[PDB]
């Protein structure tokens, strides 16, 4: 009762099993005292007691979970780490009852904020996939990784069997495809999430889990299999999956340099040779303009939509994969998952109908058996297609080469056609680059640095951070001086289009020009659109408009439009 | 009564957050201040989600225990000056109100209630109607108007705070040797500072911040704001003042200085307000006026 053991006395487990040794009163009191002495005393090399700092921030956020690193607990008082690995279900009870004392030492009357605190363990030093688990692991702490396949809704659950409740949720976990051996199906397990951990993860995420491995009797399993076979579940204890001023100053430094736009475009899709215009359009779409709206029933996208007609094998799928890896959030082929992200289409009636509604609106609506509901799309669409069989025909307008309605071509911001042209020098350049990249990728630190810096002019990590920063921070505006010139150019383009008998230019083209100019301003972190932005946007839209036309109309347009497509 | 901005309306958290004294004491314009407020509420034993509830609906137990909770905790944050005594009035079943809240409601109603010479005449005429919109609120039969006044007061303080943070973070205060200068060239909506009373509220905010930021150099301050319709700056000269808890009073000397420069200056200026410490001057003439002012020994 009164007397206590030494830490050296705990070196000898004296009972017949671990659990029957931890649960004894004197042993338990000794463990409680030692854990409290560890929590109040552990230090960084700089002093600077980490857990005093963490308990301080626990109250700053009104939180409920204290986090403890396993390596720290193993660095001193190792036997407690061993006992924790062997008997988590007891050790964590004692540890939580110590953590409440430690937190009340900082914040007296924190019991009125939350009645109970949970300790979360981190950096457990051994890992299994869902293959290696065996019966020996039962009731032991384990660390597991996989993809979350399915998720239930959150419910309350009775805590004690006056009443109290807690939150509850179950998650299905599956082996990551990269880990599965060849020629085998993936395995599955199910995880139980309790009070603080519910809705920590979403379906499709790749997740890492620490918890107890546990089992129970099930009548149906025994009935169907005909052997005394128990079912097993994992009870999670913890689950796992910004910038400084220095980054901001570096961004501003590179943006202050001339030609940053060209360098960003050059960095786009390093592995793919040529096709600069496609890279330009993709970069413009990834940055985008600013979404705007006007009472009196008008609205303007920030998102820039792009469509690309590819001859067979002209690098379309590779750039789409590159954009998938580059972009923050995206969908590859479901518009709900693309919210404020990029939507990617590589090939192509109900799907087209859905896309018609998606391009017409920015929100999707549906009804079923009396139910009515609405959803948001709010995304940039990049699409690619094969031009009506084996090969594009340049003698004909765009409509002959596609299976699309006119409003699709009307509502997309940028349209372009890519073709496998014949040239000895271009072929030699392509072949040399291809074999050079092939050798550079062969499986057989300095090598990586040389390889990286030769690959691109900008480190793509910095570019991705730059894109995220620009998208979150920069929101450019037009300057009112030169817009008289833009109106005159618009009128002139309409007049010339009518004069040759072309399909006319429209307000959609003007709106796209302004939005693309905002994107050019955003790319250099400029809050002001400038004359050169408008010039570049005009060139892009006019060239795209010219590419859609028949050959004679094309020649007349380019002869007249020379002061826009080339000059300004 | 507590020197907390409208305690018995909105919520306790908003009462601390927008208090003019608390901003000076804990530096709420940056995250390292706001975390102190979160830390205080954590130590006091008040759940943070209940602190943000409307003060009428907040739980009765916290209401009656609040008087003792402050005695144990405000010392650790150097914030003991919050406690004081004041007057409170109640009529029937409709609930209490203190004078300190009443005057804020009245001033809000005065401020926001609903070529060049004609526009100035229209503006000054509009400001006169608010006198009657406040006069009718001194009647117990018209509490409806008083509630509207309180609703306007909250928005006014919100807008003032959102401008003060922008002034401090961008460091627009220019530290001249004799006095501190600040000029607002642009803002989210600079029209609110065209009225004198709103401008003086912003000045009082900045004066508390400057008073507590450093022990040294109690200096006069000058604050100005442009108007795009007149192309004139509205300028005000403000004194320092000593902290609350601390002996003759000081006197504002900007009146004689502005009068002398006005008598001397080429500049196109106006002086007709009863408080002579506030003047107006055209866009191009601000810099020569201030140059002659700082050159003068009258400051």
């Amino acid at each position: 009762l009164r007397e206590e053991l030494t830490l050296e006395s705990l070196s000898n487990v004296k009972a017949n099993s671990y659990s029957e040794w931890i649960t004894q009163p004197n042993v338990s009191r000794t463990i409680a005292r030692e854990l409290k002495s560890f929590l109040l005393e552990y230090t960084d090399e700089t002093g600077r007691s980490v857990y005093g700092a963490r308990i301080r921030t626990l109250g700053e956020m009104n939180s409920e979970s204290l986090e403890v690193n396993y390596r720290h607990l193993a660095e001193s008082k190792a036997i407690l780490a061993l006992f924790l690995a062997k008997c988590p279900e007891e050790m964590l009870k004692i540890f939580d009852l110590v953590a409440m004392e430690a937190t009340e030492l900082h914040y007296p009357d924190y019991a009125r904020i939350h009645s109970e605190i949970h300790v979360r363990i981190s950096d457990f030093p051994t890992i299994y996939s869902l293959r290696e688990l065996r019966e020996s692991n039962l009731s032991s702490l384990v660390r597991v990784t996989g993809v979350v396949t399915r998720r239930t809704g959150v419910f309350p659950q009775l805590k004690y069997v006056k009443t109290v409740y807690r939150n509850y949720q179950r998650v299905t976990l599956q082996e990551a495809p990269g880990t599965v051996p060849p020629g085998r199906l993936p395995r599955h397990r199910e995880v139980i999430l309790l009070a603080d951990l519910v809705d920590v993860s979403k379906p499709g995420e790749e997740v890492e889990v620490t918890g107890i491995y546990k089992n129970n009797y099930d009548g149906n399993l025994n009935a169907k299999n005909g052997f005394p076979v128990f079912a097993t579940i994992i009870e999670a204890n913890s689950i796992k999956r910004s910038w400084t001023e220095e980054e901001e100053r570096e961004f501003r430094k590179i943006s202050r340099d001339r030609g940053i736009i060209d360098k960003i475009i050059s960095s786009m899709a390093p592995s793919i040779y040529g096709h600069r215009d496609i890279k330009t359009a993709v970069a413009c779409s990834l940055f985008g303009g600013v979404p705007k709206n006007v009472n009196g029933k008008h609205s303007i996208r920030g998102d820039i939509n792009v469509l690309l007609l590819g001859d067979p094998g002209t690098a379309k799928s590779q750039i789409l994969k590159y954009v998938e890896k580059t972009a923050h959030r995206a969908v590859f082929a479901a518009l709900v998952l693309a919210d404020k992200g990029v939507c990617l289409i590589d090939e192509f009636d109900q799907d087209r109908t859905s896309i018609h509604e998606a391009m017409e609106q920015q929100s999707i609506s549906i009804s079923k058996a009396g139910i009515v509901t609405t959803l948001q799309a709010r995304c940039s669409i990049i699409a690619a297609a094969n031009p009506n069989g084996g090969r594009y025909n340049s003698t004909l307008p765009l409509a002959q080469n596609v299976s699309l309605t006119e409003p699709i071509l009307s509502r997309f911001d940028i349209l372009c056609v890519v073709r496998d042209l014949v040239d000895e020098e271009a072929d030699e350049r392509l072949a040399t680059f291809v074999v050079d990249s092939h050798v550079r990728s062969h499986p057989e630190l300095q090598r990586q640095r040389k390889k990286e810096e030769e690959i691109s002019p900008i480190p793509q990590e910095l570019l991705m951070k730059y894109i995220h920063y620009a998208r979150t921070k920069i929101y450019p505006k037009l300057h009112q001086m030169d817009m008289d010139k833009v109106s005159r150019v618009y009128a002139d383009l309409r007049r010339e289009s009518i004069s040759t008998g072309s399909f006319p230019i429209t307000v959609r083209h003007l709106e796209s020009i302004l939005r693309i100019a905002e994107s050019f301003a955003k790319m250099r972190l400029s809050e002001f659109v400038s004359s050169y932005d408008l010039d570049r946007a005009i060139k892009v839209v006019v060239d795209s408009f010219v590419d859609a036309q028949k050959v004679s109309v094309r020649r007349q347009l380019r002869r007249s439009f020379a002061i826009y497509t080339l000059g300004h | 009564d507590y020197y907390l901005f409208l305690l018995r309306h909105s919520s306790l958290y908003d009462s601390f957050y927008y208090s003019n004294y608390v901003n000076a004491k804990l530096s709420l314009w940056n995250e390292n201040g706001k975390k102190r407020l979160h830390k205080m509420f954590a130590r006091m034993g008040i759940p943070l989600s209940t602190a943000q509830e409307t003060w009428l609906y907040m739980d009765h137990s916290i209401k009656r225990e609040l008087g003792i909770i402050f005695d144990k905790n405000l010392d650790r944050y150097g914030l003991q000056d919050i406690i004081r005594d004041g007057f409170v009035r109640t009529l029937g079943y409709r609930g209490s109100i203190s004078a300190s809240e009443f005057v804020e409601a009245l001033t809000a109603l005065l401020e926001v209630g609903n070529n060049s010479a004609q526009k100035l005449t229209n503006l000054r005429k509009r400001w006169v109607s608010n006198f009657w919109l406040s006069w009718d609120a001194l009647d117990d039969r018209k509490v409806e108007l008083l509630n509207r006044g309180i609703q306007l007061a909250q928005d006014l303080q919100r807008a003032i705070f959102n401008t003060g943070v922008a002034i401090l973070e961008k460091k627009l205060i220019k530290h001249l040797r004799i006095y501190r200068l600040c000029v607002l060239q642009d803002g989210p909506d600079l029209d609110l500072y065209r009225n004198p009373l709103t401008l003086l509220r912003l000045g009082n905010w900045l004066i508390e911040c400057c008073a507590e930021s450093e022990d040294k150099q109690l200096l006069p301050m000058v604050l100005a704001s442009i108007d795009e319709n007149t192309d004139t700056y509205l300028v005000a000269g403000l004194t320092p003042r000593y902290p609350r808890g601390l002996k003759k009073p000081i006197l504002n000397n900007f009146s004689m200085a502005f009068q002398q420069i006005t008598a001397e200056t080429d500049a196109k200026v106006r002086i007709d307000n009863f408080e002579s410490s506030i003047i107006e001057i055209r866009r191009e003439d601000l810099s020569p006026f201030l140059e002659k002012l700082t050159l003068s020994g009258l400051l």
Binding site: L40, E41, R48, S49, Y51, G52, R56, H106 | -
Partner: peptide, 17 residues
């Protein structure tokens, strides 16, 4: 106790800062 002084120092820094 001197060994646990860092913990209380982290506590007391809220008073100081």
């Amino acid at each position: 106790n001197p060994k646990s002084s860092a913990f209380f120092e982290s506590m007391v820094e809220d008073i100081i800062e």
